[PDB]
Design a protein around this ligand. Structure first.
Ligand SMILES: COc1ccc(CNC(=O)c2ccccc2C[N@@H+](C)Cc2ccc3c(c2C(=O)O)OCO3)cc1
Ligand SMILES: COc1ccc(CNC(=O)c2ccccc2C[N@@H+](C)Cc2ccc3c(c2C(=O)O)OCO3)cc1
Lengths: 149, 149
């Protein structure tokens, strides 16, 4: 559970926003890409696993689940690739809610930058730092530090 | 000191590798960019601070120290920008050694990908996961969790 992440893809300004959510904490990393391809998703997971102890990724769709490039990156990085089927139905809504909150934040910062990617990183910052009294950034560090010891 | 990071720029294949080192743990994030500009450096720090509690950044040179874009990103992200002057004479050496180690890893994985950026991220992965017996990834999480509590 300290190592379980969910991939999420959303669309804005004709571009794709790829998100990895740390399930237990609600912490996120995100990138803007022109279109979701296996190569991009693979590259994004490699980056993520080099930064956090990623044991399991719940993939966002069947194209990424099938992708030979995505499977190669997961093998390289020691990641168990899983489907993202919400056997828990309170997961579909939780992601939808996160895309909504994310997009709200991006709207709140959008004028602060020309490039969508800049506004997306600002939104990642504001999301991870928001106290709800611990923030996502706090929760992920505590969850994982507890696991290490 | 849980929040202190050092910027480092190194060169390979006619490109720039931008590195942020978490001073206490030796954990790193890195990116490939065409050339170090204030805008790229600013963007890299924004990404970094949204992912980890960055209190202080020791900038890698006087151009980034002066950069009005870099100062604007630091202000936005709550980052104290400082010089990277190695008042401890053993800071020049640690960085030199890290660039050497990094470039060595990149050499050990280089054939595993066409794009330098892919090899750099593999190298980041291998660096952060190496047991030294705790890894850099383990140390940074330990250091910061101890601070949160
Ligand atoms: C990240 O540091 C920041 C430092 C300062 C600001 C303040 N806002 C403005 O000055 C501004 C506002 C609106 C439109 C254009 C601009 C001018 N640009 C240069 C901002 C910028 C810088 C670095 C980047 C960017 C962009 C971008 O516009 O997307 O894209 C990737 O690296 C934002 C971000
Ligand atoms: C991260 O997932 C990986 C999955 C598999 C491999 C195995 N190695 C090869 O198949 C290979 C080896 C040498 C040359 C070209 C290739 C073919 N490409 C498509 C690998 C690749 C994929 C995604 C990317 C890349 C690149 C790249 O070549 O740099 O750049 C940004 O996103 C590496 C990385």
């Amino acid at each position: 559970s300290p190592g379980i992440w969910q991939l999420d893809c959303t669309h804005l300004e004709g571009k794709v926003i790829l998100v990895a959510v740390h399930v237990a904490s609600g912490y996120i990393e995100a990138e803007v890409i022109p279109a979701e391809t296996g190569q991009e998703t693979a590259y994004f997971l490699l980056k993520l696993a080099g930064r956090w102890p990623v044991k399991t990724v719940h993939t966002d769709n069947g194209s990424n689940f099938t992708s030979t490039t995505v499977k190669a990156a997961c093998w390289w990085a020691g990641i168990k690739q899983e489907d993202g089927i919400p056997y828990n139905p309170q997961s579909q809504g939780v992601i939808e809610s996160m895309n909504k909150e994310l997009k709200k934040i991006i709207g709140q910062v959008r004028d602060q930058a020309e490039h969508l990617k800049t506004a997306v990183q600002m939104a990642v910052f504001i999301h991870n730092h928001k106290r709800k009294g611990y923030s996502a950034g706090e929760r992920i560090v505590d969850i994982i530090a507890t696991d290490i010891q």
